[PDB]
Design an enzyme around this catalytic site. Structure first.
Site, PDB file in Angstrom:
ATOM      1  N   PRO A  87      15.065 -37.389  29.800  1.00 36.73           N
ATOM      2  CA  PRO A  87      13.826 -35.543  30.552  1.00 36.73           C
ATOM      3  C   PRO A  87      13.473 -35.468  29.618  1.00 36.73           C
ATOM      4  O   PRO A  87      13.232 -35.567  28.741  1.00 36.73           O
ATOM      5  CB  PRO A  87      15.482 -34.786  30.745  1.00 36.73           C
ATOM      6  N   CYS A  88      12.292 -34.893  30.029  1.00 37.97           N
ATOM      7  CA  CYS A  88      11.126 -33.318  29.340  1.00 37.97           C
ATOM      8  C   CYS A  88      10.918 -32.381  29.338  1.00 37.97           C
ATOM      9  O   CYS A  88      11.800 -31.898  30.545  1.00 37.97           O
ATOM     10  CB  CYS A  88      10.240 -34.273  28.849  1.00 37.97           C
ATOM     11  N   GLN A  89      11.136 -31.683  28.731  1.00 40.08           N
ATOM     12  CA  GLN A  89      11.196 -29.942  28.433  1.00 40.08           C
ATOM     13  C   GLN A  89       9.434 -29.884  27.456  1.00 40.08           C
ATOM     14  O   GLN A  89       9.634 -28.736  27.062  1.00 40.08           O
ATOM     15  CB  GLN A  89      12.034 -29.384  28.388  1.00 40.08           C
ATOM     16  N   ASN A 109       8.356 -41.409  33.072  1.00 34.69           N
ATOM     17  CA  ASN A 109       8.300 -40.154  33.174  1.00 34.69           C
ATOM     18  C   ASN A 109       7.382 -40.403  33.707  1.00 34.69           C
ATOM     19  O   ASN A 109       7.019 -41.045  34.959  1.00 34.69           O
ATOM     20  CB  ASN A 109       8.476 -39.258  32.023  1.00 34.69           C
TER      21      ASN A 109
END
Ligand SMILES: Nc1ncnc2c1ncn2[C@@H]1O[C@H](CSCC[C@H](N)C(=O)O)[C@@H](O)[C@H]1O
Ligand SMILES: [Zn+2]
Length: 678
Positions: free
Chosen positions: A441-443, A472
């Site tokens: 996951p990315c944030q 991604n």
């Protein structure tokens, strides 16, 4: 809050802290008869094949370039020529500021120059470390030594020392293994120069004197063969399929026959027809030879491969009927690899990879219970670990006797201490995993070291699998001004990988929903990097561009807006067959109402007779929102797939999955790469 190995943490923290003569006798002669030599002496320095020299160029502020010599010879003019390939600096490549200071990369551009114009000789070496996890520890010790001596050279103000590891290809956007067996031959035959002259020879129309065939774009075009023509050339649609009839007097034109696709007649005709359906026509048209885009193959309805896969990957059509445009109506005439799917999710990517025949999910990691339950239901043999990745990595580090090689917090250790005996015994071990896939996951660095990233990198560092897949959203190459992408590439290169990156569009593979996904491939130096799959469906999307350095750009796959062999998939082809429902329906097990009509519905209904997960919350015709099964169909999920949890968990699994056809295409490419083995 992230458990990372020493190498990754160290790298990220370091980044975020801020008279001429010859020698010997001639060995032979070139093609023209010029004798080539091996060693020369100039100004007290020695030049030999395999070394690196420096040249003089403008902009004196920039330090001189580095050229790896290939061959040197003496001409009848009695001069001294030397040929060298450019050694690109790390700072000028895609890595940017995160590149190593002492790193050079081989390029495919070579030039020859007079020997008297060289500035001097620079030290240069090529490192080929053995591949394997067991050597891994030893490697870092050597790196520590490499940290000391060079630093000493910084104190003593001695000239710097460079090294080269991988070949840089900006046209393919990848770092590849050095062709050692085809380099440093000292024979006057540069492979890069031969490749460049072969490429320059192509892209030119060849006027064959024989009235049977010719050459276009490096392919052979013969008579009585089926070709593609751009509809814009003919005075969004698919490629216009024609048959090469004859050539008539950049000097000949081509007269061809014609075929009509079912979508040309009416929309409803194509809505209930195959995807490889064609109509004969008697229309003949004349075009320049530069309007042909490929080769097709139209067969009969008597011999077929009988492999009705999805998506389709072979260019083959069929036609047994006639047509008449005047009337307006048609008439008659051993390689599977054990893998670990970190951040498994609902399992779409794993399902596609297993269907492709290259993977079998023996392990998985999940954060939420419903997703793990869905993965277990769809993949009974997969040993799903429903827990956070930090504690799981800490557990395997402790089991392997390397608890001193991980930056883990107290919480991770105490949570890993609660694992039972069976869970500890069922964990994998290094040397048993040959494939690692998943998408994290990315944030100032203290707030970024707790990100979910670097966990995948630490897993890859510890296990060192043969292949490595990362994925991604399309903005992964633009997060934090692209710093994270450069750091990931730098870490993967430091581990000793051949890496490549590319943006793919899911709307050109048999999915009605547009979706852009950025993928990164990594492989061991002894293995062949897989190629990108080729799109086959049209879609209104421009070329996928990734911003490189020096103003250059790279595209993973060709554009499809101009045309493609197959027509696009619309909404009616997907949700036009399911029985209607009311608002806020909460019934799970139903039965099909109508038979399959469209090609997509026929392909995706399979043989199951029990409709499932047709639940919607409290659509152009019905005053209700789309159901879970409608979304699954829109994402290419077969009806046989099973889910778990409540409706919100199902929707979250749908919105964070990967279309199975895309995974199938990627796995097919990986299978081709595996078969193409040295
Ligand atoms: N620390 C963690 N460890 C494992 N999984 C995690 C996690 N944090 C989030 N996740 C889960 O990882 C998923 C991110 S999307 C990954 C989807 C997966 N690649 C697929 O092909 O279906 C979500 O299910 C999220 O809940
Ligand atoms: Zn050359």
């Amino acid at each position: 809050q992230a458990t990372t190995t020493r190498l990754v943490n160290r790298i990220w923290g370091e980044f975020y802290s801020n008279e001429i003569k010859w020698d010997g006798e001639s060995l032979g002669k070139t093609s023209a008869g010029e004798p080539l030599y091996q060693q020369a002496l100039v100004g007290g320095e020695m030049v030999a094949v395999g070394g690196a020299v420096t040249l003089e160029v403008d902009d004196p502020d920039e330090m001189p370039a580095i050229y790896f010599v290939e061959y040197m010879f003496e001409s009848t003019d009695h001069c001294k020529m030397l040929h060298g390939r450019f050694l690109q600096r790390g700072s000028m490549t895609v890595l940017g500021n995160a590149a190593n200071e002492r790193e050079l990369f081989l390029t495919n551009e070579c030039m020859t120059t007079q020997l008297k114009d060289i500035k001097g000789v620079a030290s240069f070496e090529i490192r080929s470390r053995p591949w394997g996890h067991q050597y891994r520890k030893k490697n870092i010790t050597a790196d520590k030594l490499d940290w000391a001596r060079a630093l000493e050279r910084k104190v003593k103000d001695l000239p710097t020392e460079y090294y080269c590891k991988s070949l840089y290809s900006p046209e393919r956007g990848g770092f590849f293994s050095l062709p050692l067996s085809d380099i440093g031959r000292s024979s006057g035959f540069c492979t890069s120069c031969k490749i460049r002259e072969d490429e320059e020879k192509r892209s030119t129309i060849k006027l064959n004197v024989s009235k049977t065939g010719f050459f276009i774009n490096g392919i052979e075009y013969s008579v009585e063969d089926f070709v593609y023509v751009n509809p814009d050339s003919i005075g969004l649609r698919a490629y216009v399929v024609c048959q090469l009839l004859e050539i008539v007097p950049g000097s000949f034109d081509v007269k061809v026959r014609r075929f009509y696709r079912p979508e040309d007649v009416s929309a409803e005709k194509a809505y209930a027809s195959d995807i490889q359906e064609l109509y004969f026509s008697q229309d003949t048209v004349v075009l320049p030879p530069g309007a042909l885009e490929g080769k097709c193959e139209v067969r009969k309805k008597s011999d077929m491969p009988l492999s009705r896969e999805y998506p389709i990957s072979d260019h083959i059509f069929f036609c047994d009927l006639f047509f008449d445009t005047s009337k307006g109506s048609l008439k008659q005439l051993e390689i599977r690899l054990a893998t670990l799917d970190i951040f498994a999710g609902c399992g779409g990517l794993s399902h596609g990879l297993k269907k492709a025949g290259v993977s079998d999910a023996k392990w998985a990691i999940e954060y939420e219970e419903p997703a793990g339950q869905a993965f277990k239901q769809n993949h009974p043999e997969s040993t799903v670990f429903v827990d956070n990745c930090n504690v799981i990595l800490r557990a395997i580090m402790e089991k392997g006797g390397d608890q001193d090689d991980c930056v883990s917090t107290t919480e991770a250790n105490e949570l890993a201490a609660k694992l039972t005996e069976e869970q500890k015994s069922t964990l994998p071990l290094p040397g048993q995993v040959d494939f690692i896939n998943g998408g994290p996951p990315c944030q100032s660095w203290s707030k970024v070291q707790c990100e979910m990233i670097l966990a995948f990198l630490s897993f890859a560092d510890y296990f060192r699998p043969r292949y490595f897949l990362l994925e991604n959203v399309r903005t992964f190459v633009s997060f934090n001004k692209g710093q994270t992408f450069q750091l990931t590439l730098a870490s993967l290169l430091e581990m000793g990988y051949q890496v490549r990156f590319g943006i793919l569009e899911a709307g050109a593979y048999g999915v009605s929903q547009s979706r852009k996904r950025a993928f990164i491939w990594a492989a061991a130096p002894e293995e062949v990097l897989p190629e990108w799959p080729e799109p086959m469906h049209v879609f209104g999307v421009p070329k996928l561009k990734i911003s490189l350095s020096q103003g250059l750009h790279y595209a993973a796959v060709r554009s499809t807006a101009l045309g493609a062999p197959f027509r696009p998939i619309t909404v009616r082809d997907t949700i036009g067959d399911l029985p209607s429902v009311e608002n806020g329906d909460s019934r799970t097990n139903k039965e099909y109402k109508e038979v399959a009509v469209s090609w997509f519905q026929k392909e995706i209904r399979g043989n199951t007779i029990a409709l499932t997960d047709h639940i919607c919350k409290a659509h152009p015709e019905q005053h209700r929102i789309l159901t879970v099964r409608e979304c699954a169909r829109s994402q290419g999920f077969p009806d046989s797939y099973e889910f778990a949890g409540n409706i919100n968990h199902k929707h979250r699994q749908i919105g964070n999955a990967v279309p199975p056809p895309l995974a199938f295409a990627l796995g097919r490419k990986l299978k081709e790469a595996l078969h193409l083995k040295k």
